[PDB]
Amino acid sequence: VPNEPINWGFKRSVNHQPPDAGKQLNSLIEKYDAFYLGNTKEKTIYLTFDNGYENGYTPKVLDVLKKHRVTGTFFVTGHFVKDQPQLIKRMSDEGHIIGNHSFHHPDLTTKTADQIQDELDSVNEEVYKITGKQDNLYLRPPRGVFSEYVLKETKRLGYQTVFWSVAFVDWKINNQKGKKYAYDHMIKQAHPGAIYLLHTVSRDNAEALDDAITDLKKQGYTFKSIDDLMFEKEM
């Protein structure tokens, strides 16, 4: 502790400049193994995904990523892994990183270290049953909610907490706005070192991603993985 609830958030990117979470959050972030940006000194973008359930487009998103030769980092829940073992196997077989979004997607600030440990390990246990493998440990808190206690405890458990610097509403099933909506957000919020957080449940999201990668590459951006991000910063 302190175990005061905190929701990851920030004023969105403007002018294609990296957003800032605030002196307050930045401090807590650094204090532990957690980040929301990659290398802001180069024109690089890191794509990450939160996967809690499937709505039919993840296969196309994987096809798109393969086509553009980009490595995604998919933060999955226990329900997602159990409902979609084959997509999980594709993520692994196709070179992507599988991140941890906890088994039951609970608010971790309401959990004991003991519970936290089981919430995270059980996801890897299930992924391993499927893939026979295990990626470096990355955590994206369910609901984007954390606290100093959660950061400390998950860090003590070996996890690197990954937040984001680009996100928009591509998760409302009752109001799926379409291709343009998502594409424009991806183009407009683009900035050096950006860590995108995308979902794969909304209509035309794979097509929007396809176009955004084509156009962002044309703009001079290189897309790297979260492992790349970790290895490079460690250099």
C-alpha positions as a Markdown table, in Angstrom:
| # | Residue | x | y | z |
|---|---|---|---|---|
| 1 | Val | 0.0 | 0.0 | 0.0 |
| 2 | Pro | -1.1 | 2.8 | -0.5 |
| 3 | Asn | -4.0 | 1.0 | -2.3 |
| 4 | Glu | -5.8 | 4.1 | -3.5 |
| 5 | Pro | -7.7 | 3.4 | -6.7 |
| 6 | Ile | -6.3 | 5.0 | -9.9 |
| 7 | Asn | -7.6 | 4.8 | -13.4 |
| 8 | Trp | -5.1 | 5.1 | -16.3 |
| 9 | Gly | -6.0 | 8.1 | -18.3 |
| 10 | Phe | -4.4 | 11.2 | -19.9 |
| 11 | Lys | -5.1 | 14.1 | -22.1 |
| 12 | Arg | -4.9 | 12.7 | -25.7 |
| 13 | Ser | -2.1 | 13.4 | -28.0 |
| 14 | Val | -2.2 | 16.7 | -29.9 |
| 15 | Asn | 0.0 | 17.8 | -32.8 |
| 16 | His | 1.4 | 14.2 | -33.0 |
| 17 | Gln | 3.2 | 14.9 | -29.8 |
| 18 | Pro | 3.4 | 12.3 | -27.0 |
| 19 | Pro | 0.7 | 12.9 | -24.3 |
| 20 | Asp | 1.7 | 13.4 | -20.7 |
| 21 | Ala | 0.1 | 11.6 | -17.8 |
| 22 | Gly | 1.2 | 14.2 | -15.2 |
| 23 | Lys | 4.1 | 14.7 | -12.8 |
| 24 | Gln | 2.0 | 12.7 | -10.3 |
| 25 | Leu | 1.4 | 9.6 | -12.4 |
| 26 | Asn | 4.7 | 9.8 | -14.1 |
| 27 | Ser | 6.4 | 9.5 | -10.7 |
| 28 | Leu | 4.3 | 6.5 | -9.6 |
| 29 | Ile | 4.9 | 4.9 | -13.0 |
| 30 | Glu | 8.7 | 5.2 | -12.8 |
| 31 | Lys | 8.7 | 4.1 | -9.2 |
| 32 | Tyr | 7.7 | 0.7 | -10.5 |
| 33 | Asp | 8.1 | -1.4 | -13.6 |
| 34 | Ala | 5.4 | 0.4 | -15.6 |
| 35 | Phe | 5.2 | 2.6 | -18.7 |
| 36 | Tyr | 2.7 | 4.1 | -21.2 |
| 37 | Leu | 5.2 | 5.2 | -23.9 |
| 38 | Gly | 8.0 | 3.6 | -25.8 |
| 39 | Asn | 10.9 | 5.4 | -27.6 |
| 40 | Thr | 9.6 | 9.0 | -28.1 |
| 41 | Lys | 12.9 | 9.9 | -29.8 |
| 42 | Glu | 12.1 | 7.8 | -32.9 |
| 43 | Lys | 9.1 | 7.4 | -35.2 |
| 44 | Thr | 7.9 | 4.1 | -33.7 |
| 45 | Ile | 4.5 | 2.8 | -32.7 |
| 46 | Tyr | 3.8 | -0.3 | -30.6 |
| 47 | Leu | 0.4 | -2.0 | -31.2 |
| 48 | Thr | -1.3 | -3.7 | -28.2 |
| 49 | Phe | -4.8 | -5.3 | -27.9 |
| 50 | Asp | -7.1 | -6.0 | -25.0 |
| 51 | Asn | -9.1 | -9.2 | -25.6 |
| 52 | Gly | -11.9 | -10.1 | -23.2 |
| 53 | Tyr | -14.3 | -11.8 | -25.7 |
| 54 | Glu | -14.5 | -12.5 | -29.4 |
| 55 | Asn | -16.9 | -10.9 | -31.8 |
| 56 | Gly | -15.6 | -12.4 | -35.1 |
| 57 | Tyr | -12.8 | -10.2 | -36.3 |
| 58 | Thr | -9.6 | -11.3 | -34.5 |
| 59 | Pro | -8.7 | -13.7 | -37.3 |
| 60 | Lys | -8.7 | -10.8 | -39.8 |
| 61 | Val | -6.7 | -8.6 | -37.4 |
| 62 | Leu | -4.1 | -11.5 | -37.3 |
| 63 | Asp | -4.2 | -11.7 | -41.1 |
| 64 | Val | -3.7 | -7.9 | -41.3 |
| 65 | Leu | -0.8 | -8.0 | -38.8 |
| 66 | Lys | 0.8 | -10.8 | -40.8 |
| 67 | Lys | 0.3 | -9.0 | -44.1 |
| 68 | His | 2.1 | -5.9 | -42.8 |
| 69 | Arg | 4.6 | -8.1 | -40.9 |
| 70 | Val | 3.8 | -6.4 | -37.6 |
| 71 | Thr | 4.1 | -8.0 | -34.1 |
| 72 | Gly | 1.1 | -7.4 | -31.9 |
| 73 | Thr | 0.9 | -7.7 | -28.1 |
| 74 | Phe | -2.5 | -9.2 | -27.1 |
| 75 | Phe | -3.6 | -8.8 | -23.4 |
| 76 | Val | -6.0 | -11.6 | -22.8 |
| 77 | Thr | -8.4 | -12.6 | -20.1 |
| 78 | Gly | -9.1 | -16.1 | -18.7 |
| 79 | His | -12.5 | -16.1 | -20.4 |
| 80 | Phe | -10.9 | -15.2 | -23.7 |
| 81 | Val | -8.2 | -17.9 | -23.6 |
| 82 | Lys | -10.8 | -20.6 | -22.7 |
| 83 | Asp | -13.3 | -19.5 | -25.3 |
| 84 | Gln | -10.8 | -19.1 | -28.1 |
| 85 | Pro | -7.9 | -21.5 | -27.7 |
| 86 | Gln | -7.3 | -21.5 | -31.5 |
| 87 | Leu | -6.9 | -17.8 | -31.8 |
| 88 | Ile | -4.5 | -18.0 | -28.8 |
| 89 | Lys | -2.6 | -20.7 | -30.7 |
| 90 | Arg | -2.5 | -18.5 | -33.8 |
| 91 | Met | -1.1 | -15.5 | -31.8 |
| 92 | Ser | 1.7 | -17.7 | -30.5 |
| 93 | Asp | 2.3 | -19.5 | -33.8 |
| 94 | Glu | 2.3 | -16.2 | -35.7 |
| 95 | Gly | 5.0 | -14.4 | -33.7 |
| 96 | His | 2.9 | -12.2 | -31.5 |
| 97 | Ile | 3.2 | -11.6 | -27.7 |
| 98 | Ile | 0.4 | -12.7 | -25.4 |
| 99 | Gly | 0.1 | -10.4 | -22.4 |
| 100 | Asn | -1.8 | -10.8 | -19.2 |
| 101 | His | -5.2 | -9.1 | -18.6 |
| 102 | Ser | -6.0 | -11.3 | -15.6 |
| 103 | Phe | -8.2 | -14.4 | -15.4 |
| 104 | His | -11.5 | -12.9 | -14.3 |
| 105 | His | -10.8 | -9.3 | -15.2 |
| 106 | Pro | -11.5 | -8.1 | -11.7 |
| 107 | Asp | -10.6 | -4.8 | -10.1 |
| 108 | Leu | -7.2 | -5.9 | -8.7 |
| 109 | Thr | -7.3 | -3.2 | -6.0 |
| 110 | Thr | -10.0 | -5.2 | -4.3 |
| 111 | Lys | -7.7 | -8.3 | -4.3 |
| 112 | Thr | -5.2 | -9.8 | -1.9 |
| 113 | Ala | -1.7 | -10.5 | -3.1 |
| 114 | Asp | -2.7 | -14.2 | -3.0 |
| 115 | Gln | -5.7 | -13.6 | -5.2 |
| 116 | Ile | -3.7 | -11.3 | -7.5 |
| 117 | Gln | -1.1 | -14.1 | -8.0 |
| 118 | Asp | -3.8 | -16.6 | -8.9 |
| 119 | Glu | -5.6 | -14.2 | -11.2 |
| 120 | Leu | -2.4 | -13.7 | -13.2 |
| 121 | Asp | -0.8 | -17.2 | -13.1 |
| 122 | Ser | -4.0 | -19.0 | -14.1 |
| 123 | Val | -4.0 | -17.0 | -17.4 |
| 124 | Asn | -0.4 | -18.2 | -18.2 |
| 125 | Glu | -1.3 | -21.7 | -17.0 |
| 126 | Glu | -4.1 | -21.9 | -19.6 |
| 127 | Val | -2.0 | -20.3 | -22.4 |
| 128 | Tyr | 0.7 | -22.7 | -21.7 |
| 129 | Lys | -1.7 | -25.7 | -21.9 |
| 130 | Ile | -2.5 | -24.4 | -25.4 |
| 131 | Thr | 0.9 | -23.2 | -26.7 |
| 132 | Gly | 3.6 | -25.0 | -24.7 |
| 133 | Lys | 5.2 | -21.6 | -24.4 |
| 134 | Gln | 5.3 | -18.5 | -22.2 |
| 135 | Asp | 6.1 | -14.9 | -23.1 |
| 136 | Asn | 7.9 | -12.4 | -20.9 |
| 137 | Leu | 5.5 | -11.2 | -18.2 |
| 138 | Tyr | 3.4 | -8.1 | -19.1 |
| 139 | Leu | 0.4 | -6.9 | -17.3 |
| 140 | Arg | -2.5 | -4.6 | -18.3 |
| 141 | Pro | -4.8 | -4.0 | -15.3 |
| 142 | Pro | -8.4 | -4.9 | -15.9 |
| 143 | Arg | -10.5 | -1.7 | -16.3 |
| 144 | Gly | -7.3 | 0.2 | -16.4 |
| 145 | Val | -7.6 | 0.4 | -12.6 |
| 146 | Phe | -4.5 | 0.1 | -10.4 |
| 147 | Ser | -2.9 | 1.5 | -7.2 |
| 148 | Glu | 0.6 | 1.7 | -5.8 |
| 149 | Tyr | -0.1 | -1.6 | -4.0 |
| 150 | Val | -1.1 | -3.3 | -7.2 |
| 151 | Leu | 2.0 | -2.0 | -9.0 |
| 152 | Lys | 4.2 | -3.1 | -6.1 |
| 153 | Glu | 2.6 | -6.5 | -5.8 |
| 154 | Thr | 2.5 | -7.4 | -9.5 |
| 155 | Lys | 6.1 | -6.1 | -9.9 |
| 156 | Arg | 7.1 | -8.4 | -7.0 |
| 157 | Leu | 5.4 | -11.1 | -9.0 |
| 158 | Gly | 7.6 | -10.4 | -12.0 |
| 159 | Tyr | 5.2 | -8.4 | -14.2 |
| 160 | Gln | 5.9 | -5.4 | -16.3 |
| 161 | Thr | 2.8 | -3.2 | -16.2 |
| 162 | Val | 2.0 | -1.8 | -19.6 |
| 163 | Phe | -0.4 | 1.1 | -20.0 |
| 164 | Trp | -1.0 | 3.0 | -23.3 |
| 165 | Ser | -0.9 | 6.5 | -24.9 |
| 166 | Val | -3.4 | 6.0 | -27.7 |
| 167 | Ala | -7.0 | 4.6 | -27.3 |
| 168 | Phe | -10.5 | 5.4 | -28.4 |
| 169 | Val | -14.0 | 4.0 | -28.3 |
| 170 | Asp | -13.8 | 0.8 | -30.4 |
| 171 | Trp | -15.4 | -1.4 | -27.8 |
| 172 | Lys | -19.0 | -0.2 | -27.7 |
| 173 | Ile | -21.0 | -3.0 | -29.5 |
| 174 | Asn | -24.3 | -1.1 | -29.3 |
| 175 | Asn | -22.7 | 1.7 | -31.4 |
| 176 | Gln | -20.2 | 0.4 | -33.8 |
| 177 | Lys | -19.3 | 3.6 | -35.8 |
| 178 | Gly | -17.3 | 1.9 | -38.6 |
| 179 | Lys | -14.0 | 2.0 | -40.5 |
| 180 | Lys | -13.4 | 5.8 | -40.8 |
| 181 | Tyr | -14.0 | 6.5 | -37.1 |
| 182 | Ala | -11.2 | 4.1 | -35.9 |
| 183 | Tyr | -8.8 | 4.9 | -38.8 |
| 184 | Asp | -9.0 | 8.7 | -38.2 |
| 185 | His | -8.3 | 8.2 | -34.5 |
| 186 | Met | -5.3 | 6.0 | -35.3 |
| 187 | Ile | -3.9 | 8.6 | -37.8 |
| 188 | Lys | -4.7 | 11.7 | -35.7 |
| 189 | Gln | -3.3 | 10.4 | -32.3 |
| 190 | Ala | -0.1 | 9.0 | -33.9 |
| 191 | His | 3.1 | 10.2 | -32.2 |
| 192 | Pro | 6.6 | 9.0 | -31.7 |
| 193 | Gly | 6.8 | 6.3 | -29.1 |
| 194 | Ala | 3.0 | 5.7 | -29.1 |
| 195 | Ile | 1.6 | 2.6 | -27.5 |
| 196 | Tyr | -1.7 | 1.9 | -29.1 |
| 197 | Leu | -4.5 | 0.0 | -27.2 |
| 198 | Leu | -7.0 | -1.5 | -29.6 |
| 199 | His | -9.9 | -3.9 | -29.3 |
| 200 | Thr | -10.9 | -6.3 | -32.1 |
| 201 | Val | -14.6 | -6.5 | -31.4 |
| 202 | Ser | -15.9 | -3.6 | -33.4 |
| 203 | Arg | -17.1 | -3.6 | -37.0 |
| 204 | Asp | -14.4 | -3.0 | -39.7 |
| 205 | Asn | -11.7 | -2.6 | -37.0 |
| 206 | Ala | -9.3 | -4.9 | -39.0 |
| 207 | Glu | -9.8 | -2.9 | -42.2 |
| 208 | Ala | -9.2 | 0.4 | -40.2 |
| 209 | Leu | -6.0 | -1.1 | -38.8 |
| 210 | Asp | -4.9 | -2.3 | -42.2 |
| 211 | Asp | -5.2 | 1.2 | -43.7 |
| 212 | Ala | -3.7 | 2.9 | -40.7 |
| 213 | Ile | -0.6 | 0.7 | -40.8 |
| 214 | Thr | -0.3 | 1.3 | -44.6 |
| 215 | Asp | -0.6 | 5.0 | -44.1 |
| 216 | Leu | 1.4 | 5.3 | -40.9 |
| 217 | Lys | 4.3 | 3.3 | -42.6 |
| 218 | Lys | 4.1 | 5.7 | -45.5 |
| 219 | Gln | 4.4 | 8.5 | -43.0 |
| 220 | Gly | 7.7 | 7.1 | -41.8 |
| 221 | Tyr | 6.6 | 5.1 | -38.7 |
| 222 | Thr | 8.2 | 1.8 | -37.8 |
| 223 | Phe | 6.0 | -0.6 | -35.8 |
| 224 | Lys | 7.7 | -2.6 | -33.1 |
| 225 | Ser | 6.7 | -5.0 | -30.3 |
| 226 | Ile | 6.6 | -4.6 | -26.5 |
| 227 | Asp | 9.6 | -7.0 | -26.2 |
| 228 | Asp | 11.4 | -4.8 | -28.7 |
| 229 | Leu | 10.5 | -1.8 | -26.5 |
| 230 | Met | 11.8 | -3.6 | -23.4 |
| 231 | Phe | 15.0 | -4.8 | -25.0 |
| 232 | Glu | 15.8 | -1.5 | -26.7 |
| 233 | Lys | 15.3 | 0.6 | -23.6 |
| 234 | Glu | 17.5 | -1.8 | -21.8 |
| 235 | Met | 20.2 | -1.2 | -24.4 |
